[PDB]
């Protein structure tokens, strides 16, 4: 990518080869983290 904010017209940062072993590992991890945080949010909803 390139960060495209004003006065920022350069390549922002650099990275190594960004990959994981399992195609769905990051997707399923995201889904489970979303489940955890919605559980926390609903628990605090009921408490408050």
């Amino acid at each position: 990518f390139e960060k495209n904010l004003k006065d920022v017209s350069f390549r922002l940062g650099s990275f190594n080869l960004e990959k994981v072993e399992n195609p769905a590992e990051v997707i399923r991890e995201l889904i489970c983290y979303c489940l955890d945080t919605i559980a926390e949010n609903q628990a605090k909803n009921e408490h408050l």
Partner: protein
Amino acid sequence: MERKISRIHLVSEPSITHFLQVSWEKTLESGFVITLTDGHSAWTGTVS
């Protein structure tokens, strides 16, 4: 495991901004990884 919800969008699929909570290692200003997801294979990378 410092993961924050700042989403990414594809270059091959600019229509869909793939809703991905980015995952990097620790204190991104001392090593920052933008996480990847093309819908077909989501990737968490590494940097130096």
